[PDB]
Design a protein around this ligand. Sequence first.
Ligand SMILES: Nc1ncnc2c1ncn2[C@@H]1O[C@H](COP(=O)(O)OP(=O)(O)O)[C@@H](O)[C@H]1O
Ligand SMILES: Nc1ncnc2c1ncn2[C@@H]1O[C@H](COP(=O)(O)OP(=O)(O)O)[C@@H](O)[C@H]1O
Ligand SMILES: [Mg+2]
Ligand SMILES: [Mg+2]
Ligand SMILES: [Zn+2]
Lengths: 41, 689, 48, 595, 104
Amino acid sequence: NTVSLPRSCLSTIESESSMANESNIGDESTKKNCGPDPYII
Amino acid sequence: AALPSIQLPVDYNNLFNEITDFLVTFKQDKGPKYMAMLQKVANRELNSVIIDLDDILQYQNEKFLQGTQADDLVSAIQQNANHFTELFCRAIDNNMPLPTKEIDYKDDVLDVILNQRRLRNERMLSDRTNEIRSENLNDALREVVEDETELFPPNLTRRYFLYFKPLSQNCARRYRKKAISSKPLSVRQIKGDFLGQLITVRGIITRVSDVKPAVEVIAYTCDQCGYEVFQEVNSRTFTPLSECTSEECSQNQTKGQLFMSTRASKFSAFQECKIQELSQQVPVGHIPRSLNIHVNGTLVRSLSPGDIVDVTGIFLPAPYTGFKALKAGLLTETYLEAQFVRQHKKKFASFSLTSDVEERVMELITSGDVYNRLAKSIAPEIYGNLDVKKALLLLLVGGVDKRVGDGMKIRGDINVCLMGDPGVAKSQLLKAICKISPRGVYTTGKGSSGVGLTAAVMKDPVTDEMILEGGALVLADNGICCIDEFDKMDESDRTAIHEVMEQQTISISKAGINTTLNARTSILAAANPLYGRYNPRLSPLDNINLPAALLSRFDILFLMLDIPSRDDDEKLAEHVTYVHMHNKQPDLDFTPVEPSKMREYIAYAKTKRPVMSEAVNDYVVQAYIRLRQDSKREMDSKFSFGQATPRTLLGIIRLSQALAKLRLADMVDIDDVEEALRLVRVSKESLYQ
Amino acid sequence: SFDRPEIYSAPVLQGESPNDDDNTEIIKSFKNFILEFRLDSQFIYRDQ
Amino acid sequence: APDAVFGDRVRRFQEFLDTFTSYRDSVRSIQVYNSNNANILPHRIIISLDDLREFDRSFWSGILVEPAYFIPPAEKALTDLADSMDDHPWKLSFKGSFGAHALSPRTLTAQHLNKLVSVEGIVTKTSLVRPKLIRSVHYAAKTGRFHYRDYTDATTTLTTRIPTPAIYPTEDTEGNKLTTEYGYSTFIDHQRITVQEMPEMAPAGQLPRSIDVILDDDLVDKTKPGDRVNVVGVFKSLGAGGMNQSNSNTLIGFKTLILGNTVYPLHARSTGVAARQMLTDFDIRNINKLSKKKDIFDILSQSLAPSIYGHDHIKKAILLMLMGGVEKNLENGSHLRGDINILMVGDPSTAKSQLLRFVLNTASLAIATTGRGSSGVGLTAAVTTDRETGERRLEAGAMVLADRGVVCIDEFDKMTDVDRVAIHEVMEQQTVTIAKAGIHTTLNARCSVIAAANPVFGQYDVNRDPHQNIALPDSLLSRFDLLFVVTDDINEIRDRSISEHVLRTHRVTIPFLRKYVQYAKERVIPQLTQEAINVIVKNYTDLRNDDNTKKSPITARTLETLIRLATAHAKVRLSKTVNKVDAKVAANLLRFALL
Amino acid sequence: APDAVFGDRVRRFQEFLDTFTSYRDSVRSIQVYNSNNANILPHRIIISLDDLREFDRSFWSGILVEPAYFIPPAEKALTDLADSMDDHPWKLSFKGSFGAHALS
DNA sequence: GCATGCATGCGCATGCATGCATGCATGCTGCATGCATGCATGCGCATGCATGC
DNA sequence: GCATGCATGCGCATGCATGCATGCAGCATGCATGCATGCATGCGCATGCATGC
Ligand SMILES: Nc1ncnc2c1ncn2[C@@H]1O[C@H](COP(=O)(O)OP(=O)(O)O)[C@@H](O)[C@H]1O
Ligand SMILES: Nc1ncnc2c1ncn2[C@@H]1O[C@H](COP(=O)(O)OP(=O)(O)O)[C@@H](O)[C@H]1O
Ligand SMILES: [Mg+2]
Ligand SMILES: [Mg+2]
Ligand SMILES: [Zn+2]
């Protein structure tokens, strides 16, 4: 009201909750990486 | 799991066993048919195998009626035709008899290479088995030998092509089945539900491409190891190999550079043709659509532009090729792969005598009165007009072409021109003649002009080369070209027709084109008087718009006037109104001959070449002298379309030759010249009433 | 909707003369040693 | 996973289908037909937005404003009913009043996105119908099993979904090779069309606006270029308007189009879409009743253009042309004409153009042309264009479009020879032949003609022969079945009467006439009878052997004209055969026109 | 999507449960107890590898050597039978002789 | 009853799993640039038709 | 019949969407280290108990 969609997922910097920290890791050692341009409209 | 499995009611081992049994067992109502075919293939006298589904259905019914079980091979082939080609190939490669003829210096090179490859295969197998036996470490021995040794695969040792042909309506109707593969369809009706099936299309061919080699498997060679590497290709483009991939070079550290070898490679002869809908198939207020056909193997050169045919083929998909921005999902393009061709009208050149044709022909001659019987069967819905029909039949048959030597040439084709008052059914006769002829074309005035006649320069989509597309006059080569509204044309078209009648060629000298075309065609024209109806108060040459020389350039020039007469009008009205009440002509003592038999008889007659005797020559010279002397006085009184000239004598000779050919005789007689002069005199009674 | 093309080979000619320091000759020599070597008139390695 | 709102909406739409029983029996009837006749009908029905409005206003407004949330529930409910009632999923279509949501391509803006709309316009260009791969099936030779895979894209569902770009499988899970089974795979048809603003509604002098429409499966070839069409669908956006990645460019926006679900062709004047009405039993009873009266021809004739004074015989001729004769196709391959043509030469205030415009307004399919208005390729369709795929194609002209219809020509005498030679073939052979660079075809042009012409000297002259007054080639006149001459001679009583008539105007209805003509043309095909044969033979002989000076020549075309007129009159009579009265009427009309 | 091998294996294990009729009544008894006493028992039963050996050697060897492909089908078959009998998914346990697969 | 060795808790020194951040060099990928090609048009000239004359 | 002016189709230049690659420079990320903390371990000393004289 050049806006662009975020280049990275915003669920990491946004510490939404304490369980959100748990949800951002799983299945042993592998890190969580959503990739480049993960968002859709 | 990803890529789940599904269950279908299709077992392929059962079908392979059934294929083998059929290939070794079928009997035609002599040994097995296909075994004899395979023996001929092995001896290098055949190149293509045709599999008829009628044989398969007969085999199935024979097995059923005596109790035992059998599978439905016909429907399986119909619904999934593309998979059974290789099944049949593999079955056939397991039964081919050994060649009973030795290979000599007069065989094809492909056969030599194939035989060398087979001998090499056997030598490698024997070497491997000997080496294994000598080690001291028999089904197991051959198994281990087969496991450790390379060979040349079966596809690189075949020499034949295999095609299917559909189920005819007769066999299915007699056996109580529904032959899907032979129900003709238009391009409109072929939708995506028919992909992967064997279907038949009815249409008219509009374009054909030149034959070129399409590579199936490329071959390379390695000087380092001596192996031969083969690269399959099934795409519009491919990437050549660079470095060797054989076991020896693969296991080593220094690999060799592959070099391409054209002679060992596998090629196919390829053509692509377009097919367009017939008028009767197009809906109301729509434009006809098209379709693409692929032809491979020995079936090439079987389609020429302008042919109405029924093509058989397997309907298969292809990758999308439109604009990227308009692609929504996995879109595809369609094409037809040809397996069998049939024509609606047989060409004369392909004629051949045989019991079936001979019986019909002999019946026709036995019935007697061939001349008038053939003449009266041309457009039997038109009353009267008998001598015009005789002239038209003679134009259909033609004369004799003579090579005089020193490169000189005299035509043997007869040109006829009709010119009369309005409403005399000239157009009906033009159209009927165009429909009877196997290579006939129909044109009307200004609708066809310029490059519509002759030819134009364009670029081939399939190949990257320039070509010439023939017009009306080139499409009817060795046929009849019908021209309506002959008097309303432009000067250029008139000049082109003039040259074509002159010397059967068209010369063009324009920007980007300097060539000569072939126009071995006959002309059938129609025209009208300059003031509508004919005016008997004016000179004949003042009632028409064409130059007098052009009129003189016709063998027969007919005048058809409409003089009211209370008597003949009654007969004409009765005929026409009867024809409208029913769908047939009124006469009962005469039966018309259908177009196929007429075409057969004309094809048989065209093989003759009668010759001139001495008495006939004396009669001809006397008649020519008398007629030439007479014509000058008439032309002086300004009452002749044209004075007699040597072209009249040549036309008389041609007509006599045509009558002799129609009689099926090796020599000419006096009666033929009598009839020729009789017709040439009849040409102009309308001008003496 | 085509499938994947294949590649294969077969031996015809005799290439360059084999060198001693190439992998295939090493393999053949080792195979001969395994299947032939004798000790006390016995094929120890083949038997074991 | 399941959603509660989805289930509640499914339940509500099931209640809606329960309260109204027409769609239920429609589905039952479609299934019954498909079972009995196996042609296969598609699984689809039409719903009225009005009934939805009386039933549940909230659900109505949801479908109108939020189709992506309310329509899939309705389709599922309909599919559930269809699957429960019988011994492919089903789809829906919408009709009724769309209120403010009925727009045109010019007045369709970004505030209507994601909502259900209904647009009107003209079809400008279609696309080639292509198959789309949905499910592939394969075979492993080493194991003897069959596999498959499914594919989807963004345009097959109204709601946004997370992409799953599956690859085409060539191997097995264990490494073995695979073989494609083209006969066991599945393909669906696909097309794209363009719609523009109507030429009769767009502002003059201004460039037009257009919108794309996507069609699938059973709505793939329901229109052709040049039609007037009404398309109902969802105006939708796709992709990212340059938002993803940097994409510095800002000029482009979001791609938009319509995912159509309903296509309706509309009839207009001077267009290629023919008018058809639905015939109810009341209409059939009334028509079959009126068929039994003896002055039916007189009533139907006097019904035509009642605002004009007199010209009764021309009214009769126009009715005969509207009905028409029968065309014959012999097994040999010959064709015999069945159409009727009319020409009018008259004085310059004889109401020729009024009757011509009446014929334009009343015929189910008619195209209006003027002398110099259309010429060259504009009449025979002799113009060639080409696709962006490379091929060259043809596009229909005035008479090619009017196949099986009528064509009105005004100022006929103002034409030239180049197009008269062209129209000769149309009027006799009823075909168009084209031979250009890369085209050789023949198009059907079975149409009738009605025309009006002016005398040479401004007004018709009785002191000269007709040839000096008409001045048209004899071969052309022979192709016109009827030629009429009308003159205005001053007469006190006639002038008085026409005056009171014109004053009355200034201070059977057509729809029933159209229904009557449609039924008669569709249902009745009479045959020739010996009585009419004798009558026509006698009349043709007498006309051909008389000394009277005529307005036109006499040929076999006159005999065929007699047969055609007799058959058309019998068609008017709804009788399956031609009697003596029809032949006598044809002879009387021909004699009056000639003399 | 559905798999044909999975369904065939489910059908075969259903046939196995049909030939031997102790596990059916065991499941019935567990359900009866849980209905009457409401303590809740877990939904599980024990199968004998020996009986499987007499019944179908191929299925026996599949469970012994390819549990990831043969056991989920068996659990689904047992769950289907349990859901069909009554007016959580069920699990399986193994006893009997494990042969060479008994280790430390 | 008295003296002595032994094994059992206090009082620690010290190494090592866990877990988080930080400067940097790496490897990848969008992107500006080079380019070929086939289609569309802006237009002038040579031909055939229409209109007086 | 005879001469002029206009549509019309042929022939030649030229602009422009499409669609492919290529050297390069920017940007997010894995990696070497830099370090804090809490736990266990082994290592003696003070000593309460058992044994012998
Ligand atoms: N001798 C005849 N016999 C039957 N029908 C005829 C005859 N002469 C003319 N006709 C009819 O008259 C019409 C003449 O039209 P057409 O075939 O174009 O000939 P033309 O061009 O000579 O007028 C045709 O439809 C035809 O059916
Ligand atoms: N017979 C008639 N009956 C009623 N009105 C007529 C009649 N003749 C002429 N007119 C009137 O005169 C006008 C003639 O217009 P128009 O149809 O162009 O005649 P034309 O084409 O003969 O010049 C019309 O508006 C019409 O109202
Ligand atoms: Mg004609
Ligand atoms: Mg008018
Ligand atoms: Zn090599």
